[PDB]
Amino acid sequence: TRGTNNIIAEGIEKMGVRTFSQKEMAFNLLGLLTPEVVELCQKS
Amino acid sequence: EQGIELEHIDSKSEFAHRIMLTNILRMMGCVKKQKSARGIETRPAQVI
């Protein structure tokens, strides 16, 4: 995750790997709070 | 913590380990007692 050592971010990415902005990881994390994955957690 | 290798682990890292693990455990444990002390058996808190 890049935010306010990103200089090599472009390079690591040059290998088919993805780095993320903070708005992206936040969206990702927030997606674990969606009702769907919440109930999943409640099962195991 | 940066620039701290095995032999450098000291006061900072031990404290850091406390914030980043032991007290997180303590925190989950705390809300467990609260809920339980209130019979709250059907409203889990999700821990990311």
Next chain:
Amino acid sequence: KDTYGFSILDIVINNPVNLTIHFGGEKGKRIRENYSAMIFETIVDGKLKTEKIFKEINEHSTSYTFRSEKG
């Protein structure tokens, strides 16, 4: 407690302004179906007009809430 998720002793012991049920884990979900099966049937000229008592409780509800300004 085990079928509707509230304590009648509590309600009696300290008159609660409001009260929310939470349909938590596997037991939370067991509870809410008992809420979801509340039917009010109405035989009107041969026809049986049945409705859910708890309109809102459904497969996606996470809780219901009883309300009263007094208690």
